[PDB]
Design a protein around this ligand. Structure first.
Ligand SMILES: Nc1ncnc2c1ncn2[C@@H]1O[C@H](COP(=O)(O)OP(=O)(O)OP(=O)(O)O)[C@@H](O)[C@H]1O
Ligand SMILES: Nc1ncnc2c1ncn2[C@@H]1O[C@H](COP(=O)(O)OP(=O)(O)OP(=O)(O)O)[C@@H](O)[C@H]1O
Ligand SMILES: [Mg+2]
Ligand SMILES: [Mg+2]
Lengths: 243, 54, 125, 261, 54, 71, 241, 66
């Protein structure tokens, strides 16, 4: 009763309850996946068309940080955007002192340390977002997914949203089919497939698919949006597969 | 007991499921759950499924 | 972030006495024993050593310390609040008698410096 | 409803722990004579609801073949008071005569009320019928040819005199079936039914976790309804993937997340 | 039931109530259909347009 | 003294760790020492079976003055 | 109620709030063992691998602080990295402020003190970590320091931490009776890792392949952890003996 | 057994007092007029408000007259 009320007070048995509660917010959000490839990394999110009044490709939820790190999130959608600010502030701060873009493992650590503060004190609220962010630098590609607790892990692939289960089982099967790492050029196509399957869950409102990629081979380490003809080939490929 | 013997059918007039405006899909799922594992109990026994208890 | 225990956490009982002061002694009574005997030409202070395992070597931990070269001190109660309390003590002995009279403090005066810390750990929220 | 040794697949280690208590000193009392520990007796089963505490009771009553008595606890409270004491006294005598005998108390949440006895007079009918089970189980009385297996949902209703080891040797917690103890549950229930030739389960179930055994046998019922619409005689691997996404959804409607002792 | 959030967590599960079916508020179609189901018995005119009311 | 044990098995280790126990929770642990032995099949109640039955059915129990810093 | 929500005394006189940190720890269930050699320290811990989708490198509960100090964490990993952060800061700092790199013991002290300042403030939750420092001082030889979120700490021949740590302690107590002396008499650091893994397999009863171990070794003026290949070299030497 | 509060006792000539007469009194005295329309006659009626206006003063009145 009184451990339920409180923030940042340990339960008798030893767990924080409001970390657990903060997970709920991740499952309300829409699907998003990352796929780590041999070249770099692909990001993709399901953007729900909740009315005929929204405009197409103008209410983009994919947001870069610097010019080599893709970011898309699930949780509470204002609360996402403010962590994409925080990231920018730290990114930029590193470029002043050490004159080089920030390394991707380092980008992870400091971003995490912010989340961690809001479970240290009782006075601000534990952040209600699970994020995917990653990109390529000199060490290579890295994928990360950050949980509201303040924990990240590296991954061959990761996913988040209400349709995480349906993507997690295909993602094993894209570690079996291609055990040496598929090319990122193949993986535009493979990304679409995994959104079109995890849309039966959110089949309530029709969708619009968004991919983006950052890889050393294609885009010269510069994160971009897949657009025009390359976006048309991936759409028609996953649509005719799942029907 | 005498409470259970009164609870027993008395034939209540149907209102018909077609005069219940809207809610098309809710009538099918209800029909699927209660009415059709009684009548078609051969196609549950070939398949090998159990009937939904409620 | 924002401290919101600006108010005091100690208050008088509607029966008189401060509630937390009284508790704090019962925690001292649980502790390890130790003793002190004043003699004519010296003092003796001494405590036992309570470990968890014979794996824990207790030689490394010191429960008797020096404040100044002439004033030692021994304790019972919360192990960690001894660690910091002795530090706070050594440090403010030095910033109130090492600069301003050279010599280490007389023994009455050092006791009183320690006493200011305690009172004050009850006044601030 | 009987079934032989198998019960909860994937927990054959837990099946042996119940036989250590029941079947090993029953058949051969010569192994507990030499070691010198007083014979055990008493097992409590508790876990997330929907897990087949009840299916194991059928497994250990069929195979042993000793006399079985399935006594629901809410099915011996009667209108007459002092009659729910006299009955249950006569049953412990009964288990001594017909030895070896096993008494399965099922749904002990009814007479799990604690001290209380400030509320209604019904709360003092419990306490008076429970004191008699306490001195009959342990007192001067100590019946050597009786075994008790007790099934309870929430294991914190219980009065603190029934939590209490030495009444009740093993305190078994049944776990929500494991990583591939949900998958062992699924391979015996898809044998029964007609499958196209389906073996694609493997990832799909593991990712639909959070599943009690009672929600694993609801997904084969829902995969033979998606089949009935198509008019199929076998379950497609598309009907199975429609059902697991459906079972989890509805099973998430409620959930305390019942945390064991 | 009217409120489902206070149903027991061993009454709410499978083996016991197999299907858990939800009765959504009539959408546009449902709304329109309702107004037609009661107005039918009573007297109607060519003026009544049940889409205007829905 | 009733049951059998090896002189390898020593009870005295278990006396000093935990300081709250009732007599019934000492009748169970010995039950649980001779059932772990029944899975090895080693007639004598070893020091592995006796130490493994103690570590089971003890719970969080951090009340004991041991799980502390008030010392 | 309100007594146990913040960090004030209970009516008994126990600070139950701190004791809820103690049980907060064991959620990962990583066992670890460390021991003092003649001139090198070893620390080993279990590598839990929860999936196959996760990259196995990042999974790591061994942190390097500095060119001397390795620090093994048993607890949640969100607190772990805040623990190593504030360690790194201070360890760095100490070189600047005091003219030489920070000794083992000294770091153990500062991390105790910091944990204590969260015990008095009614708006910081205590960290749930138990930290194990390992290093090789110049003077005090191989040393190990076990610290805890109350602020309490002591020196140790060999220590463990994890759900099953009572099994592991009792092995060590048999052995440092038979040696009749402080530490394993072994010059080669490789051959101390062998002796550790044998008394861990004893205690957990469970074997270890090259993807269940994390092994950290400390030597004089160098701290390194061991690669997937080098884990399998110290394991082939046990098995062929 | 028939209260003595009569039906003119209640204050004002409000239209609200006639609504009590259009849900209870009128369809039972003449079910001829609610049979021609086809409507299910309204059977309920709630009386609510601040005290002192007679919620029980108009429910006695309607028990005398009907
Ligand atoms: N382990 C299992 N193996 C095969 N079938 C199972 C298993 N567990 C549950 N079931 C299925 O679930 C149904 C109901 O479960 P059961 O009644 O045995 O669970 P329970 O834990 O006793 O729950 P409760 O007593 O709360 O109703 C069973 O009759 C069976 O179809
Ligand atoms: N509208 C009215 N016209 C004339 N007299 C009124 C009116 N409303 C109230 N009264 C007078 O006030 C007396 C008491 O009011 P009454 O007890 O009916 O209040 P109530 O509305 O039932 O409030 P509550 O039920 O909350 O106490 C009546 O017996 C009557 O004499
Ligand atoms: Mg049952
Ligand atoms: Mg009234």
């Amino acid at each position: 009763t009184g451990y339920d009320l409180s923030n940042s007070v340990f339960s008798p048995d030893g767990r924080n309850f409001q970390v657990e509660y903060a997970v709920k917010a991740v499952e309300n959000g829409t699907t998003s996946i990352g796929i780590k490839c041999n070249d770099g990394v692909v990001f993709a999110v399901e953007k729900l068309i909740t009315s005929k009044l929204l405009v197409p490709q103008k209410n983009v939820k994919i947001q870069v940080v610097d010019r080599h790190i893709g970011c898309v999130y699930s949780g509470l959608i204002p609360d996402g955007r403010h962590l994409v600010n925080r990231g920018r502030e730290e990114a930029a701060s590193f470029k002043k002192l050490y004159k080089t873009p920030i390394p991707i493992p380092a980008f992870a650590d400091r971003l995490g340390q912010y989340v961690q503060a809001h479970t240290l004190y009782n006075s601000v609220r534990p952040f209600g977002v699970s994020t995917i962010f990653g990109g390529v630098d000199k060490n290579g590609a890295h994928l990360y997914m950050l949980e509201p607790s303040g924990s990240y892990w590296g991954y061959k692939g990761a996913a988040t949203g209400k349709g995480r289960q349906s993507a997690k089982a295909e993602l094993e099967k894209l570690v079996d089919h291609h055990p040496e790492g598929l090319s990122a050029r193949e993986a535009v196509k493979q990304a679409a497939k995994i959104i079109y399957l995890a849309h039966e869950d959110n089949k309530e409102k029709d969708f619009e698919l968004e991919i983006s990629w950052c890889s050393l081979s294609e885009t010269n380490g510069l994160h971009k949006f897949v657009k025009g003809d390359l976006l048309q080939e991936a759409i028609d490929f996953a649509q005719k597969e799942i029907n | 007991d005498s409470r259970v013997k009164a609870m027993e059918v008395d034939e209540k007039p149907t209102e018909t499921y077609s005069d219940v405006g809207g809610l098309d899909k809710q009538i099918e799922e209800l029909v699927e759950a209660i009415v059709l594992p009684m009548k078609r109990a051969d196609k549950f026994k070939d398949m090998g499924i159990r009937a939904p208890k409620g | 972030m924002t401290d919101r225990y600006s108010f005091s956490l100690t208050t008088f009982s509607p029966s008189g006495k401060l509630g937390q002061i009284d508790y704090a002694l019962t925690a001292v009574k649980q502790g390890v024993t130790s003793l002190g005997i004043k003699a004519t030409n010296g003092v003796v202070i001494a405590t036992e050593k309570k470990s968890s395992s014979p794996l824990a070597m207790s030689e490394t931990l010191s429960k008797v310390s020096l404040l100044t070269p002439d004033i030692g001190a021994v304790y019972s109660g919360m192990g960690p609040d001894y660690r910091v309390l002795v530090d706070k003590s050594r440090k403010v002995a030095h910033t109130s008698y090492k600069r301003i009279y050279g010599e280490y403090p007389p023994t009455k005066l050092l006791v009183s410096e320690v006493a200011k810390i305690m009172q004050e750990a009850t006044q601030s929220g | 409803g009987e079934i032989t040794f198998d019960g909860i697949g994937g927990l054959t280690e837990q099946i042996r722990e119940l036989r250590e208590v029941i079947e090993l000193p029953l058949k051969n009392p010569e192994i507990f004579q030499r070691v010198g520990i007083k014979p055990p007796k008493g097992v409590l089963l508790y876990g997330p609801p929907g897990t087949g505490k009840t299916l194991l009771a059928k497994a250990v009553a069929a195979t042993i073949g000793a006399n079985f008595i399935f006594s629901p606890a809410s099915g011996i409270v009667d209108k007459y008071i002092g009659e729910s004491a006299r009955i249950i006294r006569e049953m412990f005598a009964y288990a001594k005569e017909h030895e070896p005998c096993i008494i399965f108390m099922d749904e002990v949440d009814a007479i799990g009320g604690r001290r209380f006895s400030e509320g209604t007079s019904a709360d003092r009918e419990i306490q008076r019928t429970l004191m008699e089970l306490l001195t009959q189980m342990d007192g001067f009385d100590n019946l050597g040819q009786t075994k008790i297996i007790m099934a309870t949902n929430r294991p914190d209703t219980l009065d603190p005199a029934l939590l209490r080891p030495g009444r009740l040797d093993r305190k078994v917690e049944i776990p929500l079936p494991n990583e591939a103890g949900r998958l062992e549950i699924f391979k015996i229930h898809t044998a029964k039914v007609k499958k196209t030739g389906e073996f694609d389960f493997e990832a799909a179930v593991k990712m639909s976790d959070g599943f009690n055994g009672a929600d694993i046998r609801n997904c084969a019922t829902e995969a033979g309804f998606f089949a009935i619409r198509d008019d199929r005689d076998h379950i497609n691997p598309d009907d199975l993937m429609k059902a697991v996404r459906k079972v989890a959804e509805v099973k998430k409607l409620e959930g305390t997340i019942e945390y064991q002792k | 039931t009217n409120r489902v959030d206070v149903l027991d967590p061993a009454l709410l599960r499978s083996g016991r109530l197999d299907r858990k079916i939800e009765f959504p508020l009539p959408s546009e179609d449902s709304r329109a259909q309702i107004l037609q189901i009661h107005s039918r018995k009573m007297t109607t005119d060519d003026d009544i347009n049940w889409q205007e009311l829905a | 003294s009733k049951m059998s044990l090896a002189p390898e098995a020593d009870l005295d280790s278990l006396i000093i760790r935990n300081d709250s126990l009732s007599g019934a929770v000492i009748a169970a642990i010995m039950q649980e020492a001779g059932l772990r032995a029944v899975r090895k099949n080693r007639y004598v109640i070893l020091q592995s079976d006796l130490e493994e039955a103690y570590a089971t059915q003890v719970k969080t129990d951090n009340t004991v003055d041991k799980f502390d810093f008030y010392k | 109620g309100y007594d146990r929500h913040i960090t004030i005394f209970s009516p008994e006189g126990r600070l139950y709030q701190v004791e809820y940190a103690f049980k907060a720890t064991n959620q990962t269930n990583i066992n670890s063992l460390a021991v003092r050699g003649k001139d090198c320290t070893v620390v080993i811990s279990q590598k839990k691998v929860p999936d196959k989708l996760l990259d196995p490198t990042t999974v790591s509960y061994i942190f390097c602080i500095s060119r001397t100090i390795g620090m093994v964490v048993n607890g949640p990993i969100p607190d772990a990295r805040n623990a190593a952060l504030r360690a790194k800061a201070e360890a760095a700092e100490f070189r600047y402020k005091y003219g030489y790199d920070m000794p083992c013991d000294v770091l153990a002290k500062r991390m105790a003190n910091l944990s204590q300042i969260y015990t008095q403030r009614a708006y910081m939750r205590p960290l749930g970590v138990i930290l194990t420092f390992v290093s090789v001082d110049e003077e005090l030889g191989p040393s190990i320091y076990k610290t805890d979120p109350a602020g309490y700490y002591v020196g140790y021949k060999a220590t463990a931490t994890g759900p099953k740590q009572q099994e592991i302690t009792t092995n060590l107590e048999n052995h440092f009776k038979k040696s009749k002396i402080d530490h394993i008499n072994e010059e080669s650091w490789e051959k101390v890792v062998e002796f550790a893994i044998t008394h861990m397999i004893d205690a957990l009863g469970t074997e270890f392949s090259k993807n269940d171990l994390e092994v950290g070794v400390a030597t004089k003026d160098k701290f390194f952890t061991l690669s997937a290949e080098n884990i399998e070299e110290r394991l082939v030497a046990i098995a062929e003996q | 057994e028939k209260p003595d509060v009569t039906y003119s006792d209640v204050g004002g000539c409000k239209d609200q007092i006639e609504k009590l007469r259009e849900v209870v009194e009128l369809p039972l005295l003449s079910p001829e007029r609610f049979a021609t329309l086809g409507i299910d006659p309204p059977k309920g009626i709630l009386l609510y408000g601040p005290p002192g206006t007679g919620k029980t003063l108009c429910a006695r009145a309607v028990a005398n007259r009907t």
